[PDB]
Design a protein around this ligand. Structure first.
Ligand SMILES: Nc1nc2c(ncn2[C@@H]2O[C@H](COP(=O)(O)OP(=O)(O)O)[C@@H](O)[C@H]2O)c(=O)[nH]1
Ligand SMILES: [Mg+2]
Ligand SMILES: [Mg+2]
Length: 299
């Protein structure tokens, strides 16, 4: 009975690291590929990092919130860290719940054109102000996506690469050649949310943008990065036209380069999956990634 057990250990770690804090209630309310999120005392979110990753950790995430809560002028709420424990082995962040409804393609489609346009304006304006921030104070929070893929590719070569089939290697090797040819990294750098997809966007009762969660991957990176998922054409995101539109509101950006950046990210996804499986040792992720490769080599 796994989640009853998870809630108990988490209740313990919270009251152990944060002495004055007493957990009267606690529930698992969410989980991404990095963290598990707990609603505590029905007002706080405590998340903890279960994924094995060093480049994107809670040290930097806390730095980013604290930077942004200081420099952003906006009525969009973001997490505000009231509790933190950071160690290499285990990290916790605690903050008052960002209250609201999560945006979905489903919610958006039944929105009036009027509510759609103001939401798209809210999103564009939030990205514009954050991408505009002088980022001197968190200058250590730079992210090099190219360099990161290079390291992950090295990890493949040092692990399972040789036991991959030829078309799998062809796939990886084709991506690597493209990654070395593209020009999408040659552009403007700034602070990006960097995981900016529907499921992090909260709406108030008027379907207005009220909150943004999970700056867990944020850093100084390509301006293009915050449009990767807005441009995504899947069933959990609204659609490419949505991203196209927001790119137009945002202004002063090469939409074609943006599209090239998401498409490169998209090509990497099966490899990212296999890498994610290798790092955390969840072999069903290596399977999926490997199977996803075959499903694209046959266009
Ligand atoms: N309603 C609400 N949900 C939250 C809040 N913080 C986290 N969550 C949920 O917890 C999930 C995982 O949190 P997240 O910060 O994205 O962790 P990650 O995806 O693994 O990096 C999110 O997708 C949300 O579902 C919050 O302040 N309010
Ligand atoms: Mg998330
Ligand atoms: Mg995250």
């Amino acid at each position: 009975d796994d989640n009853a057990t998870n809630v108990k250990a988490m209740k313990y770690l919270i009251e152990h690291y944060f002495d004055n804090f007493k957990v009267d209630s606690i529930e698992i309310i969410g989980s991404g590929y990095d963290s598990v999120a707990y609603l505590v005392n029905n007002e706080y979110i405590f998340k903890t990092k279960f994924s094995t990753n060093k480049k994107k950790g809670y040290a930097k995430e806390k730095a980013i919130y604290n930077f942004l809560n200081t420099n952003l002028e906006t009525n969009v709420k973001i997490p505000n860290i009231e509790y933190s424990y950071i160690s290499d082995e285990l990290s916790i962040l605690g903050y008052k719940e960002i209250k609201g409804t999560f945006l979905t393609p489903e919610i958006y489609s039944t929105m009036s054109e009027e509510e759609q346009n103001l939401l798209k304006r809210d999103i564009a304006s939030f990205l514009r102000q954050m991408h505009g921030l002088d980022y001197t104070d968190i200058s250590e929070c730079t992210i090099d996506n190219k360099q990161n893929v290079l390291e992950e590719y090295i990890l493949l070569r040092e692990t399972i690469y040789n036991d991959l089939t030829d078309i799998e290697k062809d796939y990886i090797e084709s991506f690597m050649e493209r990654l070395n040819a593209t020009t999408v990294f040659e552009g403007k750098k700034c602070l990006c949310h960097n995981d900016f997809s529907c499921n992090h966007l909260l709406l108030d009762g008027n379907n207005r943008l009220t909150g943004i969660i999970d700056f867990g991957d944020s850093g100084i990176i390509d301006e293009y990065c915050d449009f990767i998922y807005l441009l995504e054409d899947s069933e959990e995101e609204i659609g490419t036209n949505f991203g196209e539109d927001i790119l137009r509101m945002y202004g002063n950006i090469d939409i074609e380069k943006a599209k090239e950046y998401q498409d490169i990210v998209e090509e990497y996804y099966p490899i990212e999956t296999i890498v994610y499986g290798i790092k955390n040792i969840k072999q069903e992720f290596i399977e999926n990634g490997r199977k996803e490769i075959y499903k694209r080599t046959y266009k």
